[PDB]
Design an enzyme around this catalytic site. Structure first.
Site, PDB file in Angstrom:
ATOM      1  N   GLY A   1       0.795  -1.218   0.000  1.00 23.52           N
ATOM      2  CA  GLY A   1       0.000   0.000   0.000  1.00 23.52           C
ATOM      3  C   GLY A   1       0.826   1.265   0.000  1.00 23.52           C
TER       4      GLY A   1
ATOM      5  N   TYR B   1       2.100   9.539   3.158  1.00 20.74           N
ATOM      6  CA  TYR B   1       3.411   9.769   3.753  1.00 20.74           C
ATOM      7  C   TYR B   1       4.459   8.677   3.469  1.00 20.74           C
ATOM      8  CZ  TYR B   1       1.132  13.701   6.088  1.00 20.74           C
ATOM      9  OH  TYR B   1       0.453  14.871   6.345  1.00 20.74           O
TER      10      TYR B   1
ATOM     11  N   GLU C   1       5.334   4.417   1.367  1.00 18.73           N
ATOM     12  CA  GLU C   1       5.038   3.255   0.543  1.00 18.73           C
ATOM     13  C   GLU C   1       5.562   2.049   1.298  1.00 18.73           C
ATOM     14  OE1 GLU C   1       6.892   3.953  -3.117  1.00 18.73           O
ATOM     15  OE2 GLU C   1       5.005   3.878  -4.260  1.00 18.73           O
TER      16      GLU C   1
ATOM     17  N   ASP D   1      -1.017   7.850  16.923  1.00 17.98           N
ATOM     18  CA  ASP D   1      -1.745   7.398  15.712  1.00 17.98           C
ATOM     19  C   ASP D   1      -2.349   6.036  15.952  1.00 17.98           C
ATOM     20  OD1 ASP D   1      -2.863   7.892  13.188  1.00 17.98           O
ATOM     21  OD2 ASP D   1      -1.041   7.218  12.087  1.00 17.98           O
TER      22      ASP D   1
HETATM   23  C1  LIG Z   1      18.077  -3.582  -4.698  1.00 19.01           C
HETATM   24  O1  LIG Z   1      16.640  -3.475  -4.555  1.00 19.01           O
HETATM   25  C2  LIG Z   1      16.127  -2.563  -3.724  1.00 19.01           C
HETATM   26  N1  LIG Z   1      16.592  -2.577  -2.455  1.00 19.01           N
HETATM   27  C3  LIG Z   1      15.910  -1.624  -1.719  1.00 19.01           C
HETATM   28  C4  LIG Z   1      16.041  -1.271  -0.378  1.00 19.01           C
HETATM   29  C5  LIG Z   1      15.257  -0.246   0.125  1.00 19.01           C
HETATM   30  C6  LIG Z   1      14.384   0.397  -0.726  1.00 19.01           C
HETATM   31  F1  LIG Z   1      13.738   1.496  -0.268  1.00 19.01           F
HETATM   32  C7  LIG Z   1      14.200   0.048  -2.050  1.00 19.01           C
HETATM   33  C8  LIG Z   1      14.985  -0.984  -2.568  1.00 19.01           C
HETATM   34  C9  LIG Z   1      15.123  -1.604  -3.883  1.00 19.01           C
HETATM   35  C10 LIG Z   1      14.352  -1.364  -5.137  1.00 19.01           C
HETATM   36  O2  LIG Z   1      14.247  -2.173  -6.026  1.00 19.01           O
HETATM   37  O3  LIG Z   1      13.786  -0.145  -5.181  1.00 19.01           O
HETATM   38  C11 LIG Z   1      12.955   0.141  -6.337  1.00 19.01           C
HETATM   39  C12 LIG Z   1      12.177   1.433  -6.167  1.00 19.01           C
HETATM   40  C13 LIG Z   1      11.357   1.476  -4.873  1.00 19.01           C
HETATM   41  C14 LIG Z   1      10.670   2.829  -4.658  1.00 19.01           C
HETATM   42  N2  LIG Z   1      11.655   3.916  -4.687  1.00 19.01           N
HETATM   43  C15 LIG Z   1      11.199   5.214  -4.147  1.00 19.01           C
HETATM   44  C16 LIG Z   1      10.054   5.921  -4.863  1.00 19.01           C
HETATM   45  N3  LIG Z   1      10.185   7.382  -4.713  1.00 19.01           N
HETATM   46  S1  LIG Z   1       9.882   8.178  -3.338  1.00 19.01           S
HETATM   47  O4  LIG Z   1       9.752   9.559  -3.688  1.00 19.01           O
HETATM   48  O5  LIG Z   1      10.883   7.787  -2.393  1.00 19.01           O
HETATM   49  C17 LIG Z   1       8.320   7.628  -2.737  1.00 19.01           C
HETATM   50  C18 LIG Z   1       7.198   7.747  -3.544  1.00 19.01           C
HETATM   51  C19 LIG Z   1       5.967   7.344  -3.051  1.00 19.01           C
HETATM   52  C20 LIG Z   1       5.860   6.831  -1.770  1.00 19.01           C
HETATM   53  C21 LIG Z   1       6.987   6.716  -0.975  1.00 19.01           C
HETATM   54  C22 LIG Z   1       8.226   7.110  -1.453  1.00 19.01           C
HETATM   55  C23 LIG Z   1      12.302   3.968  -6.001  1.00 19.01           C
HETATM   56  C24 LIG Z   1      13.074   2.669  -6.258  1.00 19.01           C
END
Ligand SMILES: COc1[nH]c2ccc(F)cc2c1C(=O)OCC1CCN(CCNS(=O)(=O)c2ccccc2)CC1
Length: 327
Positions: free
Chosen positions: A44, A48, A50, A154
């Site tokens: 979900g 604030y 993900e 909360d």
């Molecule tokens: C080597 O694999 C991983 N290891 C992780 C370890 C921690 C983690 F936060 C993500 C990963 C991760 C991975 O595949 O991440 C892929 C995505 C996961 C999501 N992020 C952040 C998205 N942008 S954001 O602005 O931080 C955000 C947007 C909406 C809700 C909450 C935060 C971008 C990269």
């Protein structure tokens, strides 16, 4: 101006702690390695953060990864400090790691996995015994965090994770949690609308752990009366009117007088005048098996306007309502 207030329990826990305990802004984050985790599916996304079901590839265990949105990244040290301070406490989610997300650099908290559903999915289908049992488990978490000088701020069914098969519960989402410092004025824009205490609704900033006890009372009323939410306000002003239709206006006015609270002039044209209602009014043939004089007496002692008059978590654990729970 407003009359000051202080918690009647665990008042000075943070004053006696070394600065390191509560001065979260001074904390040095010993960052982990993002590469140790593999994201499986999105559980979900709120306004604030993900949340994702994930696997720690260094030990093959199922974890939960919570990535903070750029907006909620500001007080990450507070949530980390609180999670570390409470680690190993009863029914508190365990923080396993803190990493930086690769594509967005925002902090990501890593938690131990909880096998079954959200409490909101279960809490309207429980028996009388199970309501008592799970309320007691939540109370263990609240008394522990309050004893550690922390207010959750909360408490709601979406923040309680229940593994009904293994009869286990975890209190999660410590993103709004704060250290209690006697005399401090806090932000009233905390907790979810239906669980906000009257102190937040009347803009009384010197609140304490007792805010969580109001929120727990709202959860209990919802469960025992099968009414979700129990106080269904349209906005923060109508929320106080919904509460006043149940607890009455006499006790609300006695509360604002006690603390010299300035009531928003918009409340004069919407609060009206209301009678303190008997809890048996919410009892019907379909929920009577969940209600007992002990349940009503307990609920009555939680849902009080005066935050100083509510049961504390430890006092709540002493209530006859829990005598039937195996300990
Ligand atoms: C080597 O694999 C991983 N290891 C992780 C370890 C921690 C983690 F936060 C993500 C990963 C991760 C991975 O595949 O991440 C892929 C995505 C996961 C999501 N992020 C952040 C998205 N942008 S954001 O602005 O931080 C955000 C947007 C909406 C809700 C909450 C935060 C971008 C990269």
């Amino acid at each position: 101006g407003p009359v000051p207030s202080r918690a009647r329990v665990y008042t000075d826990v943070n004053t006696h702690r070394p600065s390191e305990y509560w001065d979260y802004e001074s904390h040095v984050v010993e960052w982990g390695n993002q590469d140790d985790y593999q994201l499986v599916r999105k559980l979900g996304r709120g306004k604030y953060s993900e949340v994702f079901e994930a696997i720690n590839i260094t030990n093959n265990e199922k974890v939960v990864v919570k990535i903070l949105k750029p907006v909620a990244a500001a007080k990450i040290k507070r949530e980390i400090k609180i999670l570390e301070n409470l680690r190993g406490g009863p029914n508190i989610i365990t923080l396993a790691d803190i990493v930086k997300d690769p594509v967005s650099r925002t902090p990501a908290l890593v938690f131990e996995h909880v096998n079954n559903t959200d409490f909101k999915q279960l809490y309207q289908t429980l028996t009388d015994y199970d309501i008592r049992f799970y309320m007691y488990e939540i109370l263990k978490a609240l008394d522990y965090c309050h004893s550690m000088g922390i207010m959750h701020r909360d408490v709601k069914p979406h923040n309680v994770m229940i593994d009904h098969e293994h009869r286990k519960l975890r209190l999660i989402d410590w993103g709004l949690a704060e250290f209690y410092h006697p005399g401090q004025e806090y932000n009233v824009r905390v907790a979810s609308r239906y669980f906000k205490g009257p102190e937040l609704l009347v803009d009384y900033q010197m609140y304490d752990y007792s805010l969580d006890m109001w929120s727990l009372g709202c959860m209990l009323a919802s469960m025992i009366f099968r009414k979700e939410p129990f106080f269904h306000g349209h906005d923060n002003y109508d929320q106080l009117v919904r509460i006043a239709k149940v607890l009455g206006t006499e006790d609300l006015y006695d509360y604002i007088d006690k603390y010299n609270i300035e009531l928003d002039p918009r409340f004069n044209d919407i609060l009206g005048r209301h009678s303190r209602k008997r809890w048996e009014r919410f009892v019907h043939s379909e929920n009577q098996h969940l209600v007992s004089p002990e349940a009503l007496d307990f609920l009555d002692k939680l849902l009080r306007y005066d935050h100083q008059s509510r049961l504390t978590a430890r006092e709540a654990m002493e209530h006859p309502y829990f005598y039937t729970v195996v300990k």
